[PDB]
């Protein structure tokens, strides 16, 4: 069953993306359409979550800008993601960072672990 699932959509496993640790600061180059023009904006922030399976692995990036925390999910294998870059890796003993949605201001940093 599940072998027949991914052997259809192995052709859409977009392998351009660097596999990263869930929970680290990260920027995403998102291609969008504003006014029938294709621009690219950059979405910095830390990864709360990597979950899912196969083609439907959804992750998210949290950005805290202008005092209002912005959480922005993406499934991994979209054509509407141009470039993902690891800016600083992170260590978290946990794996899904739901407690970051409350804490702001330096009780919410994740220490760079030199890689």
């Amino acid at each position: 069953m599940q072998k027949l699932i991914e052997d259809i959509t192995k052709e859409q496993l977009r392998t351009d993306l660097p596999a990263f640790r869930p929970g680290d600061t990260l920027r995403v180059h998102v291609k969008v359409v504003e006014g029938n023009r294709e621009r690219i904006q950059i979405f910095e922030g830390v990864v709360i979550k990597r979950r899912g399976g196969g083609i439907s692995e959804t992750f998210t990036v949290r950005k805290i800008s202008y005092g209002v925390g912005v959480e922005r999910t993406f499934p991994v294998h979209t054509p509407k993601i141009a470039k993902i870059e690891v800016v600083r890796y992170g260590k978290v003993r946990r794996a899904k960072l739901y407690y970051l949605r409350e804490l702001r201001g330096k009780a919410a940093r994740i220490k760079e672990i030199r890689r």
């Binding site: 069953m1 027949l4 959509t9 083609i55 499934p75 294998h77 979209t78 054509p79």
Partner: protein, 206 residues
Amino acid sequence: TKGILGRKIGMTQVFAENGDLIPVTVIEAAPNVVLQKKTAENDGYEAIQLGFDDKREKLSNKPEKGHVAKAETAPKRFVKELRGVEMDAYEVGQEVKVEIFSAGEIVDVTGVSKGKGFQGAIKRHGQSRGPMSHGSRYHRRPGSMGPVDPNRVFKGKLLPGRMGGEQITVQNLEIVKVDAERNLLLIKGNVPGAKKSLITVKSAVK
């Protein structure tokens, strides 16, 4: 005026040429063979009967053998029937693959919906309940039965029973992509039926 039948597996999530993600079922229909072409001159109506599974030796009965062996291809487990097709296109024993369908047309989907067992009159009919506090000992119950004087309960008031199991159709769906080299149909939407349950796939009346 067409239709094949297959076996549901489970949902996926398939991209379609945009960021547009589409809910997608995985219907596998190994190539169906017409087992009997019913004519209006003797059976009184115009129809056709498919067949779908690779039966084993011990599974089959002898009357299931002799019905097949006129157009001897293979004993097939599930037998259904389609009123109203072009009878002039087919003959008794013709193998029908996925080559009928494209990735862009309006497609009807019936099926055999799931089970919920003996579960009663909130989940079975969507009704509300009384309040959960203010001393009320009433919640999860099917309401009043009716007024006094007609001395009975009307046939059409709803009650606890055995939800699900019935045959249920979903109209005007659409096929995402046709992958006929493994006999696979991908249909936009959530299709009724549990894992490994069988579905007729028509072309709807738009």
